[PDB]
Each structure stands twice: as structure tokens, then as C-alpha cells.
């Protein structure tokens, strides 16, 4: 947690709405949300792939 505040988060919405307007801000939110989706996709892939390397390689040597 990087020192998140209530007034700090409201300002970004207030500053973002004024600077971007109701034509670029929602696109920015979608673009920002797309970055989170990529991080979740990377996290989902890495966690499964890392597990698929520890468990199977250890189990293969047992056989």
C-alpha cells in the first residue's frame, strides 16, 4: 500500500475528469483496466507454469 488516501483518490478522478473530459477518461480507465488484465494473465500463466515445472519434474524422477 503506497500511501493511498480518500482525498488523494478523489483528486485523480477530479483532475482526470477535467483534464481528459468525458471522451478520453473512460478510454483511459479501459486502457488501465487492460493493463491489470495482462498482469492477471501473466500471474495466472506463471503460477501454473511454475507449478508444472516443480511437481512434474520431481515426480518424473521418482518414476
Amino acid at each position: 500500500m503506497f500511501d493511498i488516501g480518500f482525498s488523494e483518490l478523489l483528486l485523480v478522478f477530479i483532475i482526470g475528469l477535467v483534464v481528459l473530459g468525458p471522451q478520453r477518461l473512460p478510454v483511459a480507465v479501459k486502457t488501465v483496466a487492460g493493463w491489470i488484465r495482462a498482469l492477471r494473465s501473466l500471474a495466472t500463466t506463471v503460477q501454473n507454469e511454475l507449478t508444472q515445472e516443480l511437481k512434474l519434474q520431481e515426480f518424473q524422477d521418482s518414476l
Binding site: 483532475i15 481528459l20 515445472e53 519434474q57
Partner: protein, 231 residues
């Protein structure tokens, strides 16, 4: 074996080297804990008003705060060592001949951080402390806490070191192939919101601080775009 296990094996070794470098430098400077703090506090002591000294409101502050500074002094001193290991971990992924260009670039990015710290210490610190100390309201005694002074001092060193790198980073990217002044001008509204977000994640939970740190980043971005046109 196979990747995603050797990668963390390499990262573990690089993390150990960064940890060892931080510890070794910290241990060397651990004895002179007050000497560096005397150097750090010297700009403020000179500009402190008559009858005003530094105070320690925390019980362990007289001993922890000089110790804290030395640990974070070692972090800056070991930054070239830390950055080398980070580059080395990503070096195999940069075999596309971009490795040659980034080796001086990371080295060149190291002095700029130190020059910014030197500029803040030698030019800005006497000017800021000479004004901030002698501007208190009537009846207010400026008794600066040594713990709060360290956080204020290191924020300025962080701010100015990053401040010096931004224009050169913008110019270099806008110089060869990555960006052009036209592109950075059409991304001006997004940097303004991005500066507030970056400051929000870097300043304490106070609307005044985020509003005050965000503007310099936009100002630093503005001059960098201005300098790129002079290429």
C-alpha cells in the same frame, strides 16, 4: 530444472549480491553514523534561527535515526551495484544488440542521480532551509525533529535525483527512434493525470503533498519536450 526455476535461481544470486553490497557498505559507515548526520543536518543548522536547535521526540530516535540514514546512504552508494545485477538478470533477454547501448546508459543514469543530490545539497538545501526555518508564525519555535528531518531530506534527494534523469531520458528516447516531440505533446493530458497518480503512490496520504509533488514532474516533462525539439 527448465526455465522459471533457473530464473529465480539467478535472481536469488543477484539478490544476495545486492544484499551483501548493502550490508558491507552499511557496516563500513555504521561507526560514523553521527558524522554523516552532522553533514546532512549542516545545511539546516546553519540556517536555524537563534535559540532554535534540533530535537528528538522519539525515544529511540537519537540512535535509530543516524542508523537509519546510514542504511539508506548505503542504498544510494550500492545503487550501481544493484543496477548491475538487475541488468545482468535481464541481459540474456537483451541479446538483440540493445545490450551495448544500455550499458553506458545505466552508468550515465547513475551520475545524474548523484548530481541531483549534490545540486539539492549544495544549492537547494541552503536556500530552502534559509527560508523555511526563518518564516515561522510569531510565537512559534522552530524545533525540528531529527526523525522528521531525515524523511524530508531524503525525499528531496529522491525528488531531485529523479528530476535530473527525466529530461535526459525524454531527450534520449525522443532522439534516436522511440518518440518524437509531436507524440509527447499529444500525451500531455495523460502525463498530468499520471503525475498525480505517481505522486499519490509516493507522497504520504495528504492531498496537499500529492498536489505539490505532481506539478514538478509535469514541469520536468515540459522542459524535456522543449529540449528535444532543439535536437
Amino acid at each position: 530444472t527448465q526455465p522459471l526455476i533457473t530464473h529465480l535461481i539467478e535472481l536469488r544470486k543477484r539478490l544476495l549480491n545486492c544484499i551483501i553490497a548493502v550490508i558491507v557498505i552499511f557496516l563500513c559507515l555504521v561507526y560514523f553514523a553521527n558524522d554523516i548526520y552532522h553533514l546532512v543536518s549542516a545545511p539546516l543548522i546553519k540556517q536555524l534561527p537563534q535559540g532554535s536547535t534540533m530535537i528528538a521526540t522519539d525515544v529511540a530516535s537519537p540512535f535509530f535515526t543516524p542508523i537509519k540514514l546510514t542504511f539508506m546512504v548505503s542504498l544510494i552508494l550500492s545503487a550501481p551495484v544493484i543496477l548491475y545485477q538487475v541488468w545482468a538478470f535481464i541481459a540474456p533477454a537483451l541479446y538483440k544488440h540493445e545490450r551495448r547501448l544500455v550499458v553506458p546508459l545505466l552508468v550515465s543514469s547513475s551520475l545524474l542521480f548523484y548530481i541531483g543530490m549534490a545540486f539539492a545539497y549544495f544549492v537547494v538545501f541552503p536556500l530552502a532551509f534559509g527560508f523555511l526555518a526563518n518564516t515561522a508564525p510569531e510565537g512559534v519555535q522552530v524545533s525540528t525533529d531529527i526523525a522528521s528531518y531525515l524523511s524530508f531530506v531524503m525525499a528531496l534527494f529522491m525528488a531531485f535525483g529523479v528530476s535530473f534523469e527525466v529530461p535526459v531520458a525524454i531527450v534520449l528516447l525522443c532522439w534516436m527512434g522511440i518518440t518524437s516531440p509531436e507524440d509527447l505533446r499529444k500525451k500531455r493530458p495523460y502525463v498530468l493525470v499520471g503525475a498525480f497518480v505517481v505522486g499519490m503512490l509516493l507522497t504520504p496520504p495528504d492531498v496537499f503533498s500529492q498536489t505539490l509533488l505532481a506539478i514538478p514532474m509535469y514541469c520536468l516533462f515540459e522542459i524535456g519536450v522543449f529540449f528535444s525539439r532543439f535536437y
